[PDB]
Each structure stands twice: as structure tokens, then as C-alpha cells.
Design a protein around this ligand. Structure first.
Ligand SMILES: *[C@@H]1O[C@H](CO)[C@@H](O)[C@H](O)[C@H]1NC(C)=O
Ligand SMILES: *[C@@H]1O[C@H](CO)[C@@H](O)[C@H](O)[C@H]1NC(C)=O
Lengths: 503, 503, 503, 503
């Protein structure tokens, strides 16, 4: 028996030595190689190409004629920049119209994140954000039913945007992570800054979880070639404006400004006051105001409303972050829904998806992130026409009790959001049809048809950046190639052209 | 004893942690690196080379004179395209003949798939197909005897065709897989489409297997960076036209059209009717018709015939595929054999290898995959002269009872198969001799000798594609370098030149 | 029980086989790949770029006009060279002043060595040295308190300086190692030569260690793709000039000359003689001499002084090295401190950091490494203004009892150190401010502000080399990006410009 | 106890699964990556460089003026070719002398094979051969004493010669292997052909081994990405001409011609006849003939001689090789020694190292590998002056009883070996001095000094090939950098220039 208690001890020493070898020598070197081949070499080849071709241009000029700063110094990878809006330089003449249009191509961006073949799995609720160099992506994997199924796993993919010699920008994953205990999460969303990514997840109560109940938040910090740091925000670490029974983090993601993070949230809150719901519609014909009020109530109850709010995460650098919210009144909003926080130069913007009877674009601008300073846009495009149970029309948009569960955001191409890019989706008898469009400040829309070989697309989120000194955008969508396929997440890219037309 | 039940439990935790590390971190990163070095970097360097050289061409033009679309957007890798047939543009003049000829080079394409040195192993029955970007390859590994030996393993190698700076196209393996329980498989064949590969295997009964008996099929789906999905097709999931005792899948492979797969099959079927076998021969001299009838019977039995059939796999996207066959009558065919399904523009073609007394090319064209719509070609070349026990001549091809076990297919270079490329093999007293040839529509054959340093080549299969805007072909053959070597699978490439001769 | 003693034995055989596979096949190949992607490929691409661009230059010259040695042969990597000082070629004219200035850029050099996110860890006491091709880096990781905390680990990173297509030189790690039993080390420092690195560590006594006691040294030899060789230097293997109770190795590092190594050391030594401390100051007004004497005493004791010494490691190639020291008298120095040994052509230099009341630059030159041959410079810049408890002024620098714990070295750009480069740090109410400067031989200083987005920088060490045929320097600093961050080590690079001004 | 017999079984399943994963997925992919980064990418970049630079040359020609085959098709890697001797094209004029000289550079070729830092290990007896694309290298590792120490291991390194953008050719290892049971091996040598390497080892008897006794041979076959195949040649599988008590394989290596291998061997053989030893010397003055006879006897015994022989390995492709030898008479040779077999066009050559009193070059040519057809050269250079106990002079070379244990071979640069390259070594009071030289057919020697920073070099072997269309040579030597270093194996390269001088 001593030899046994001895032989087992021998196995322990051999197993520990092997485990140390894999963690100490091999894992580190494999990570270094991944970066060298996926990021660094492509960057070196790209710089070579640019310099050689530019010299050849000077030779072309010479033959015909003779016959026959400080800002990028702290950057690791300078392939992309934050968006620098186009200006009408020289388009201030009589009858000379400055506009923007999408290009004719819609290129694939493969391997944005991992996937699978199992028909029992569904990929949904993508959250995508592009920072100054890096991108954050997150995808929920649910069992069978996509919307009401169990969460099997949430996957976060930190990576970089690089130039690989293709017609558009390409993704390069550096770190993939799987959130522990996914079964107790209501929702997660991402945010990104300078070489740092953030994830904020809202969690629930347990008895096995108790569905859509609220019990604080988790915050995760992601860095290149570094371990993930988790923080628990509970107890007195958070303060909500209204009392919430159920809290969700808005799908579209958040932003980082200085030492604070901003996210959009929505949820089910307690109410002890009468309301006058916002009720804007066309020439439909008292009854409509009643419907507008019942449209924001949970189960028709005067005391429990579904509403939107701003969520601020304070002082992240201290290691002990706190959360403070500010809620929108029912008089200046519609039934609470998934939204997104934008940074627009020195100003901010907010997108709120349709979820009720009003299917018009709801997007606002503000000098600071607060409720009382928000000014709403008067544009209508896009109108959400999919994943809805509403029977009203796109002209009058009359109030009724119905629901919508889609998401189609926009990306501002100017400081006042007078110009913007979006993807439209129209239902048909054979899946869906869709297009890319840019709306100008005169109300005109330039549009090009996309993805003719996909059975259906149900959603879209857009993030733009500078690449090769012009604006490029990446769109992430959910859909199916063939009618019988499970739902998967796809990504494509396109360019925005500057044009000026002499009328 | 508790410390033992404790020390063992400690080993379990350490072993699980190590296993998770290798599967979670290392395997994924190694796969990403393989793609980066074998596919992505080569693509980037190739694009650089093309752009720089083209600019230099413009400079050459400048000096002398002054003194002294939407289709590839959804593609991951655009190195190759489906074949675009050459047209006689400007060869419509009097006495001006449009033709095609092979080039003078026959380049090696190394590492198409893995191999071994053991003299106890034989590599045979290759199945090769090139899709829109990817290729599928499969090789059987048998013990000692090559044809009648036990199957040790079947290996499937999914990979891509890339440009590595060599004189021709090169292979780049991405995924290698070994079919489980190979001992119960009669045969497997491959098919490929757009980034998806398929494998169909016919299986037998068990008591240890019972030789050449039939018990349904297995279908496997292969995708890049994805797990392999297997389906069992048995019970009422398949319906055969005739009752078969033994079913084999044709070696040459199949195609994918829309949501269906098409394969060629052959096997031993029950018969209750009299027959009049197809019996076409030259000026040999009642007795011949009798021999032609007994040539298609198993063991001379009127009731059991060996015949060919089309095999269709219906609705693969549903996850629950079914199989339906359609059998060729004995009056329009010869003893059943290994064949191949071709896609020729909007039309289809079928190749049937010689297996009996008739050794002439048997190839047909059809508007749809059915028996009654097939029209057979009247060309003879190539004539199979190897691996045969027949003693007839190449002129009269007189009926007798004999067998042939080779395979030499062709690849159409025009919609009506009036032009095509093939490899001829002629036996000698020192292994074999062979050549590459292209037959034109006037019946002329251009040919170039190949592989002068190989003792023998016994078979060949050809797949063609566009590369660097001209047609290139890859030939996969079985053979031996030196007389005493075991049989191995080799691959080489060549180009097809466009020529027009003013007579 | 036999089956158990048998099943365990089976596990042993399987575990040994697996461990051998990882050590024999995989580890070696991973190391070879790391070099190929991080060093060899970048070198090949860089050489291509240079040759192509130079040819294009000749074409530019041709168009306009016609219209419209043996020294690097033994080198593995020729990207960098030892510094070749600039000369005033053609600046010997009347009113024509030869000078040197820093460039305007300060580029990031990422991944010089590994790091971490834990807030409980602090990275301090960096030691950095650049050899003929390779570099040595070492960083101490302490728990919580940075200066008085426990040592958790010391990490040594041997690597190479390479060209990766960026604006400046970049680091490429080859070997990372962790010194065993870090808890018994007083301090470590690095040195580097031709493809060989060295580390010298001073160790203490144990009872758990006994704080700042002395018990000999360890020497480690580092080579590329090779195991680390350790030597113990104790007993009669070392001889110190004075009797030391506590010995530390100077932070800045040492040099290799022929078969010997030279390091700076300092420590607490026994004294039986009266002293007259060096006491140089300005127009402050007997009392000052008394303060100057008590400033070099430990706890005010006449018998125990803190002093500097040279440390020589003799005959390293024999495998049995020995150590001999030579101590500086209190009459020609100040309280002992961290320093650095320099090689300046055929001559040597020594830097001694401020640690007491005198905060002016203390740097000397010598024809050989000995105390009696050292001649001190009369320059003042830089003056250390951070990490000090002194209340004197930068003009008079009056004696008092105080302490300083910073480190800001210089790098000579000429044989007589009449020109040199340094980094200045000035404290403010919001962390610190800093700049890069080059002082010329007329006493003028050219300076450029750096790192505007870093809350604070507390130290700097500079190493220079030739790159792309001009002098480039890498500065390694300790600091924080945001006020609440833990301390981390950062590295940046800049260039030194040659200028000549016609007055 | 059942739970124990159960928990152990669980560990077995987990360990087997992990072992299969590492062998099935990871090992294969790592090997593919090594080739991609070390061989394939460098080849692609090199081809780019050549094509771009050649176009630029044509542009240079254009500006000034206008103003201001089938043989490599079967090759995997075409970087190098077998030597094509230079011809005096246009040097057939009066007073116009055709010659060859070495270049001035002697470049390092790093990582030819692995090494170590342990001072207890010595690397000796290198065997190096270059084939049509690949190279074979083998190094013995002995404990402490280098010549009489125990063999710890023999390491074989199969690799390729590639272009990495450096001034000369570089090595790229693909497969490293360690011969099992090295303790029973007398000696090993390598040979190489077309993508196949061979190793032949002579083994001894065991009681623990019995020193220098003979018991047959082992043959190993090495192929890229393939397992090593071993064969035992014993019993009646070999037949030696004379009866040998002890057999060694000549250090320099062998060749492959068709299906046979040729090696040089030497050993201790039985003798029953009187002898008349070859005794060629200068004007020294019966006694000398007696010394010449005793110089070839073992321990002075008439019945036991030390002699050379040819060793042929017959029919390697069959898998059952046999060995037949043919011995040189004492009347046409000197004491047996290490030699080398050369292929010189259609003819063969043999090199025999000095081992006795005659220290002049001994090299012969033959139309076939046999004793009776060998014709010896009359050149003297090089004369071996190191590792000898002889006291005779380089002029008369008088017979005595002494021994020499060096090795300095030559490489023919012409069909008749009238031109050749060699490395000379001259002893001094400070290690050794050496040079590279080329001897022409007029007896003139061009020489250049090498390795000025190496304490000593004791041996050299040379293999030449075509690279960038001119002859390049790699020399492998044994030596020490610093006096106190252990012996290690180094490799360097140089070029042979074609010159023609008008007198
Ligand atoms: C050949 O076809 C071209 C059109 O592709 C036509 O322009 C030309 O006239 C035709 N030539 C003859 C001889 O028919
Ligand atoms: C040298 O040989 C060339 C042929 O290679 C021949 O044309 C020439 O005339 C010869 N010159 C002399 C002097 O023989």
C-alpha cells in the first residue's frame, strides 16, 4: 500500500511538471506567434506596398514632364482612426450640392468571432463596438428556440482591425473568453476605448435562476495579452433613480469618456403617479390617448411601467466602480427598449429601438448625458417593418396594443446627424430583402441592394471608422443563408463616398 | 485509504484542468496560425506582386512613347474560379483553325494530403474534387494487398487552393479527418460546393463485417474551422429503384446543385426480366450477342445483374436528407462500374469507366439528371489499356468474358464536350508510359509525355479551374516511383493554352 | 490490488510518453516558429524594401539627367550596431556651430517584456541594457507597497531589437525566465555582450530570510535557444576591499569587456578611521562640514558608513568566476547609491544617482576601472527634483540630513561626454511633467516635451545604438497612466539629429 | 475499493483522450506551420524580389536608350542545384589565364543543428552532406573527454537549404532525431539524394558494450514529414572481403547512386600474408621500409592490419538491403583512416585522411567504385599539421611510428579535380590560424584568412552547390571560441569567383 501511496505521488509530480510546462512555455509563445502572423506581419507588408507604389507614381510624373505628426506616436497599430467627418470644401457655390453615397460593394469580413455547426444552437443578440484600434464583440448562444431558449454560453471576442491585402478591412481575434455562470445573466453589452475593452452584465436572483429579477451587475475589464479582471457591483455600490424589479443592459453597447462608462438600460419599474404618455401620430381620424397610456404599462397596470434610462459607471480606474442611473419620463418616451449610446464629437447621441406601435426612427442628441438636455430628431427613415405584430400603416402610424422585437441602428456621419448611414429591411414572401443607404441633409436617400443570396436578415448594427483615408463601415447582422438553416451572425463592410454635384 | 481516494481525486482535478487548457486555448490558436501562414499571408504577398509589376509595365510604356465586380465580394479567397470556357474570338475567318493544346510543363503539387513510409500500407481509391475555392480529397489505406486487403483507415483532407509564388497552384490543407469504423464501409466519395464539402459512404452489415452486403448510407458535412456533422440515412430514408444486394458509391465523386447532391452508384441488383445487352463492336467476323448478355450477369445468372444508377441526395439543408436512385437498363449500358458526375454549365455529364470487354470512352451529356435524357458521345479516346485481362484489339473491340479494373476520366473544356483533356497510359515491359493530351473538335490530338522518372502510373483523375486568368488543371494519380515501392498517391498540375492557326 | 498496482503503472507509462512528446517535439518547434515570425521574416521584408526603393531612386535620377565589409559576417542579425559618435565634418568654419538635438517624436516600443493587470502587484527597479544585437531586461514584481513590499518574482527577458516596418525600432522577446527563490535576493542587475547575456544577483542570509544581510552572489548566463547556467559565488570565491554587512548590485547594470564583467555596487561597510566627507556647495552663508560627515553615516555612527565600490567578476569563461571589489573613499564621494557602468570607446564611465543632499549630476570618466583614475565631470544637468525629502535649493544645494530615492541616468554621445542625452522630470500638483533633452559642449540644451497623457513618471534609463545609419535611443521608465493605476514599466524610442548652424 | 478501481479507470480515459489530441491535432499542425514560416514564405518573398528588381533594370536600360525548362518541374524547392563546374569560355587566347578564387567574406550559417551549454558535454565527429535540395547533418555528444568519453547521444538533423534575405544561404531544420541505444555504436555517417536521407551505423557486441568489436550494421531512412524507418543488417545480410574484428564507417559520409549507397569504411582485419607497405617519401638520406611495414600493423603484429575498404549497400528500395565490401591492399595504401566518397559527374572520388607518418593529401579518382580502377592524385596541398604526434618535416615526410587524428577534406571544382577548394589549418602558440583557398590547375593557390576571433579550429569538411547561379560552399568545422570553452560545431559559407587574367 506504501508503494501505491508512492506511485500515486509520482504521478502527481509528473502531472504538475507537465501542466507547468504547458502554462509557462507553450501558451505564451503560441500567443506571441498569433500576434506576429495575424497583426504585425500584415502591417509590415502593407507599409511596404504603400511606399513602393507612391515612388512609382512620382516616376510616372517625372517621365511625362521631363520628356515633355505627434498623434499616432503612442499607438501600437495605426491601421484605423476615429471618424473624421467629410466637409463641403469648395461646394459652397450656387447650384452645387454636397452629398454622400454608399459604394457598390459589400465585402465579407470573415472570422469576426467563432461559430459552430450544431443545429441545436442559435446565435443571437450581438453587441459590437469599434474603439481607436481594437474591437469588442459578444454573442449569446441559446438552445433551440433563439428568443426564449436557455442560455448555453456568452462569448466575448477582443480583437483588432487590420489590413490583410483585401478590398476592405479584416478582423483579427486576439482574445476569446466565455462568461461563467451564463444562466443567471439577463443581458450583457460591450464598450471600447484605447486598447481597453469593457463588458457590463446585469444579473438576476437565484432560488436555479429566477427569471428576469434583478440583483446588481458585473463589470469585466479586457486588455491585450492580459487576464480578465472582474468586479461585482452590488449592495450600496449602485443607486437607481426609480425602483426597478427587472433591469436589462441595452444591446447596442456603450462608450467610455475619461474615467466613466455610459450605457443605455431599460427595465420594469414601480410607479405611483398618473401618466400622460407621449402620443405622436398622423391623421388617423380621446381613444388614442388611452391606447398610448396602456402601451407603456406592464399587463395594463397603472403601477408598473416599462421605461428607458441612462446608466453611468463611475470611476472605473479605482478598482471599485459604482453605478448611478437617470430615468426618462413616460411623457417623453415610448415603451422601454434596447438602445445604444453614441459619441458624436464633443456631443452624445442615443438610439432607441421601436418596441411598440411607433415604428419610426427615435434618435436624440445632447451636449451631456442627461434626460433634460436631450433633443429628438425629426427624421423617419428607417421604419422598422420586420419582427412586428402591429397592423398599422407607415403613413399614419396609429396607436394600438402590439409589439416589435427588432433592432436596426444608424451611424451619424456629421456633428448634427443631418447625414447618416443605415440598413433597411423589407419583408417578403421569400424571407427578406435589404439595402444600404445614406440619407443626406436635403432628405434624399441613396441606396444599394445587398446580400441577394441570403434567405433572410432580421437586424443590423453599424460602426464606422477611417481606413485608407476615407470612411469605411462594418455592419453586423443576424440571419440565415438558406430557409432551413439555424440563425447565425454575419459581418460585412462598405465604403462611404464623397460626392459634389453641379446642378 | 481516504488519502488515496483523496490523492486520486487531486490527480483528476489537475488532469481535467490541463485537458481544458489544451482544448480551450492552444488548439484554437494553432488552427488560426495555420490559416494565417498557409493561406492569408501568401494571398497578401501575391496581391502586392501583381500591383507593383503592373505599375512597372506602365512606366515602360510611358518612357518609349513620351521620349518617342459584385461577384467576388462574398468570397473569402479569390485565388481560383470555376472554369470559363475559351471562345474562338476572331477565329471565324477562312482557313483559321481554333484549337487548344497542353503546356510543356507538369508541375508537382506537394502535400495535397498526408502520407506514410510503412511498406505494409497501400494508398488507393482516391477521390478528388475542386469547388469554388476549396478542395476535397479522400484516400483509402489498405493492408498489404491494395485491392483485396483490409481497410485500415479512410482519410478526408479539406483544404484550399492557393498561390505560393511557384510556377503553378499549390494545395493548403485546413482540416484532416479519419472516418470511424472503416471496416464496415464498402466505399466513400466526395463532393464540394461553396466553402462546404460533403462525403457519402455506403456501409454494410455486421455479424466483424459481412463482405459487400448493403445497409444504408452515411453522409458527412465538412466546413472550415468547424466540427464534422454526421447523418445516418437508413430505414425509410432511402428508396432504390431496383432491389440491391450490394451498393457502391462511384469513385470519381459527385456534385452539389442547389440543395441536392448527385452521385453515381453501381451495384448488384435483382432481375426478373429477360435482357438484350448493349453490344456495339466492329467487323469481328449470334455468338457475340450471347457473350454481351453473359458479360453483365453475376456468375452467369439471368437473375442477378451488375448495373449503374444515378443517386440523388434530397434536401441536405434540412438536417434530415433522403436518397432516391434511378437505374440504367442493361440495353443502354455495360457491366456496372465506377463513374463520375460532372457539371457542364447548365447541363450535366456522366463518366463510366470500362470494366468489361468494351474499353472505349463511355461519356454522356444530359439537360437533367435522369436516365432517359442521356445522350452518349461518339469519341473513342482514351482507350483503357492497363489493368485488364481482355485479349481483344483496339480496332474491333470484340465481345468476350473478361474484366478491367482501371480508371481514367476526362475533363470537358466546352459546353458540348467537343473539346476535352485526358491522360493516356500505355503498358510496357518496364512499368508504364503516359502523356497529357487535349482533343479538339476536329478529332486532332495534341500530346506531351509526362513523368519520365516514374516506374508506373495506373490511374488518373482530372479537375480544372481558372488561375491567373487561364485554365489550369490538377491531375491526381496512383503509382510507384521505383519498382519495389508500395503504391502511393501523387498530384501534378498543368496549363491549357489557347491557340489559333492560320492555315 | 495487483490490478490497481497495475492500472497505476499503466498511467505512469502514458503520462511519461505524453510528457516526452511535449518536451521533445512541440516545445522545440514552437521556439523555432517564434524566431521565424518575430525576427527572420521581418528582416527579409526589410531588406527587400531597401533594395527596391534604392533602385527607384536611381530611376528618378536617370530620367531627369538623360531627358535633360568583413565586420558583420559573423553576425546573426545586423539590424543594429554599437554607437558611432557623430563628428563635425565641415563644421570647422568661422561662426559655424556643430550641435545635436532630439527629434520631435517619442514612439512606443510595446512588449519589451511581459506585464499583468493585478492591482496587488507593482513593477519596479528595471534594469535594461543593449548589447551588439540583443537586449537584456529585468523587472522586480513586489506585493502592494512597491518599495517595502515582499518580492513575489524577478523576471528576466532576453530578446532582440528588430525592424518591423514601424517608425522606430521594436522589441522581440526570445527567452523569458523567473529567478528561483526571489525572497532571498537583495538585488539583481543585467549586462550584455555578443549574443550572451549576464545577470548578477546579491543574496542574503536565512533563519525565512533575514533582511539586508549579505551571503555571496549568484551569476546567471543567458544564451539564445539555450538553457540558463547558474553559478554560486561564495566562500573564498569573492574578496571585498572593505568588510560589508550588506551588499546591493547597482540598478543600472554592468558591462562585459573581454572575459571580465564590471558592475557597480554599494553597501554598508565597517569603518575604523575618521573621515572628511566630500562637501561641495554654493554660497549658503563649520556646521556644514559636520552635516556632510553625518550624511554618509548609518544611524549617525562613526563606525558604519554607506559607500560605493567597483565590482569585477573575473574569468567568466572558466565556469568558476570570482569577484573582487575596490571601494571609493568618503572623501571623494557621497552617500552610497544605485549607479551604472558605461563603456565609452576605449574608456569607461560611471554614473552615481543622488541619494542625499547633493542632487546634481555625478558622473565620471576613467581610462581603466579603478578608483584612483576617475575624473569627475563639472556639469549639473539634470538635477533630480523628484522622490526627495530635501528642502534645499537648486542654486546653492546646502547640506542637510535628507534622502532621495530616484534614478535618472544619462547616455554619452561623445568620447569625452561633452555631449549627452537625458530625460528631465519636474514635479507638479498633477503628477509630473517631463522632457527629452540633448546638452551640447557649449552648455546649451535642446529640449522637447514628452508623454503629455501620463499622470506621472518617476525614473528613466537610456540606452542608445545605431539604427538605419543614425543614432536612436530607447528610454525605459517607471510610472502611471492614470492617478489610480498601479506602477508599471513603459518603453519609448527617439532619434538624435545631427545639425550645424551658420551664425 | 471499487470506487478506486473506478477513479483510476476515469483517469485512464482522460489521459488517453489528451494524448490522442496532442498527437492527432497539435503535433501535425505545428509541423505544417514550421514549414510554412521557415521554407515556403521565404521562397515566396525571394521570388518577388527577383522579379521586381529585374523589371527595374529594364526601365534603366529603356530611359538611357529611348532618351538617348522541364528539369525543375518535379522539385519542391528550387533554391539550390548540384554543382555545374565553371568553364573557360573565351579564355583560350594567348597569355589569358583562367582561374578561380574564393571571395573575401565568410558568412555565418546559424542553427545548422541544435546545441547546448553544459560544460560536461562535447560535440564531435560531424558528418555533413548536401543533396539536391536537402541536407543531412549528424553530431556525436560525448561526456567530458571528447575523444575517449562515453557517448551520451547521436543527433541527426534533416533540413533544407533556403534563401532568407541574407548575404549567403541559410539552414532550415525540418526533422531532428536521436539514435536509440547510442552506447553500442562504433560510428555513424550520412548520405543524401533527392528528398531522401540515409544513415549507416556500425554496431558492436554486448556482454554493457564490449569496446570496438563488430556485430553488423543499422540503416535508417529519413524522409520529410515522415517517420524514420530502421533496418537491421546482420547474419548473412552482409559479406566482407576480409575478416574484420572491428569496423567503423568513415566520418565524411557517402553517396547514393540509383538504388545503391556507397560509403567508405575502415577497420581491423586478419592477415595471413606477408606485406610490402606503400612507402613514398623524399630525400631522407632499408630501415624506412621496415618502419613503413610496422606503421600499418596493429601493436606491431604481422597478422592484424588496419586498412581501408569500399562499402556498398545493395538494393535499398527492396526493404531488405545487403552489404558487400572490397578491401584495399597494404601495398597501395597507408594505415586505415576516416574518409569520404565523392560523386564527380559520371566518375567517383575518394578522400582518405592522414592517420600515420604521411601527412600529404591522399585523394583518388575512378570510373567505378572498385579498388583496381583507382588512380591517385599527385598534389600535396593541404598538408595536415594539427592533432599529430609526428616529428617529421613537410618536405621529406620521412617514415616513423606516430599518429594523426585530424580531418580536412577537399571539394573538387572540376571533373578531373585539377581545381579544388580546401581549408588549411596551421598551429600556433595561441590556438590555431586558418584560411580558405582554391588551388588552380597551374599549381597556384589563392587564399584568404578566416575566423580571426576563434581561439582554435581543428577540422573542416566542405560541401558545394549552386546558389543564385554561382558556386557557393558550406564549411563545417569543430573548434572553440575562447580557450576555456568546450568543443562545439560551427558552420560558415563562402563563394567561389570565376576570373580570367590577361597577362
Ligand atoms: C468574327 O466575330 C466578330 C465578333 O466577335 C465579328 O466582328 C467579325 O466580323 C467575325 N468575322 C468573321 C469572318 O465572321
Ligand atoms: C575559344 O572558343 C570559342 C568557342 O567557345 C571559339 O569561338 C573561339 O574562336 C576560341 N578562341 C580561340 C583563341 O581558340
Amino acid at each position: 500500500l506504501k508503494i501505491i501511496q508512492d506511485e500515486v505521488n509520482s504521478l502527481k509530480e509528473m502531472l504538475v511538471s507537465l501542466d507547468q510546462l504547458v502554462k509557462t512555455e507553450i501558451k505564451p509563445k503560441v500567443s506571441l506567434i498569433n500576434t506576429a502572423v495575424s497583426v504585425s506581419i500584415p502591417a509590415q507588408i502593407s507599409n511596404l506596398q504603400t511606399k513602393v507604389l507612391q515612388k512609382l507614381v512620382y516616376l510616372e510624373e517625372s517621365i511625362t514632364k521631363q520628356c515633355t505628426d505627434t498623434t499616432d506616436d503612442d499607438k501600437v497599430d495605426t491601421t484605423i482612426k476615429p471618424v473624421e467627418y467629410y466637409k463641403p470644401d469648395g461646394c459652397n457655390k450656387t447650384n452645387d450640392h454636397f452629398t454622400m453615397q454608399p459604394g457598390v460593394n459589400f465585402y465579407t469580413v470573415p472570422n469576426l468571432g467563432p461559430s459552430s455547426s450544431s443545429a441545436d444552437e442559435c446565435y443571437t443578440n450581438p453587441s459590437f463596438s469599434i474603439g481607436s484600434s481594437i474591437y469588442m464583440f459578444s454573442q449569446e448562444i441559446r438552445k433551440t428556440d433563439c428568443t426564449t431558449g436557455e442560455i448555453l454560453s456568452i462569448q466575448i471576442v477582443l480583437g483588432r482591425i487590420v489590413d490583410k491585402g483585401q478590398q476592405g478591412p479584416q478582423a483579427s481575434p486576439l482574445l476569446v473568453w466565455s462568461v461563467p455562470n451564463p444562466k443567471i445573466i439577463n443581458s450583457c453589452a460591450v464598450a471600447a476605448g484605447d486598447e481597453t475593452g469593457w463588458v457590463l452584465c446585469s444579473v438576476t436572483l437565484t432560488a436555479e435562476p429566477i427569471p428576469h429579477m434583478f440583483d446588481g451587475f458585473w463589470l469585466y475589464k479586457f486588455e491585450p495579452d492580459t487576464e480578465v479582471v472582474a468586479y461585482r457591483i452590488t449592495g450600496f455600490a449602485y443607486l437607481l433613480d426609480k425602483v426597478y424589479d427587472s433591469v436589462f443592459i441595452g444591446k447596442g453597447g456603450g462608450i467610455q469618456r475619461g474615467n466613466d462608462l455610459y450605457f443605455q438600460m431599460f427595465g420594469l419599474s414601480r410607479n405611483r403617479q398618473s401618466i400622460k404618455a407621449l402620443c405622436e401620430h398622423g391623421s388617423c381620424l380621446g381613444g388614442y390617448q388611452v391606447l398610448c397610456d396602456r402601451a407603456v404599462m406592464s399587463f395594463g397596470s397603472e403601477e408598473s411601467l416599462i421605461s428607458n434610462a441612462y446608466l453611468k459607471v463611475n470611476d472605473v480606474a479605482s478598482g471599485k466602480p459604482t453605478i448611478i442611473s437617470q430615468t426618462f419620463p413616460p411623457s417623453d418616451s415610448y415603451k422601454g427598449s434596447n438602445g445604444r449610446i453614441y459619441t458624436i464629437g464633443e456631443r452624445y447621441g442615443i438610439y432607441l429601438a421601436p418596441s411598440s406601435w411607433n415604428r419610426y426612427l427615435r434618435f436624440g442628441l445632447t451636449p451631456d448625458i442627461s434626460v433634460r438636455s436631450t433633443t429628438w430628431l425629426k427624421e423617419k427613415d428607417p421604419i422598422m417593418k420586420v419582427l412586428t405584430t402591429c397592423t398599422n400603416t407607415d403613413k399614419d402610424m396609429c396607436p394600438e396594443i402590439c409589439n416589435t422585437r427588432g433592432y436596426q441602428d444608424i451611424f451619424p456621419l456629421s456633428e448634427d446627424s443631418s447625414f447618416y448611414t443605415y440598413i433597411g429591411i423589407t419583408p417578403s414572401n421569400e424571407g427578406t430583402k435589404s439595402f444600404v443607404a445614406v440619407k443626406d441633409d436635403a432628405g434624399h436617400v441613396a441606396s444599394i441592394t445587398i446580400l441577394p443570396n441570403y434567405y433572410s436578415i432580421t437586424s443590423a448594427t453599424i460602426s464606422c471608422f477611417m481606413y485608407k483615408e476615407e470612411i469605411w463601415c462594418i455592419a453586423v447582422t443576424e440571419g440565415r443563408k438558406q430557409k432551413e438553416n439555424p440563425q447565425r451572425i454575419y459581418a460585412h463592410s462598405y465604403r462611404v463616398q464623397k460626392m459634389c454635384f453641379n446642378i
